[PDB]
């Protein structure tokens, strides 16, 4: 029972780490996308 509890806790922590990583990675993805949009608008303005 003790071993099973340890294994179950480790599996929960693994899955939660994976999901939190997915969330944070998407957040940085959209942040970088916004930075890229600002970048391209700046480039066209400076070229004109």
């Amino acid at each position: 029972a003790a071993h099973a509890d340890e294994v179950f806790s480790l599996e929960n922590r693994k899955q939660q780490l994976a999901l939190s990583m997915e969330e944070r990675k998407q957040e940085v993805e959209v942040h970088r996308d916004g930075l890229r949009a600002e970048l391209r608008l700046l480039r066209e303005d400076v070229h004109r």
Binding site: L10, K25, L35, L39, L42
Partner: protein, 50 residues
């Protein structure tokens, strides 16, 4: 062992995201500086034409 490897890989992906973000920030700062100095140059060009 899998959780150790997972945490390491997640931390690596994090530092990668800040790396590319820093690159983008540097480029945008360069662009803003170029835009403002180009405005200064256009003012000087107007003065020369005058």
């Amino acid at each position: 062992e899998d959780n150790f490897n997972l945490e390491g890989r997640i931390m690596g992906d994090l530092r990668a995201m800040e790396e590319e973000a820093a690159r983008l920030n540097s480029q945008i700062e360069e662009g803003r500086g170029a835009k403002r100095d180009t405005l200064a140059e256009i003012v000087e060009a107007e003065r020369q034409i005058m």
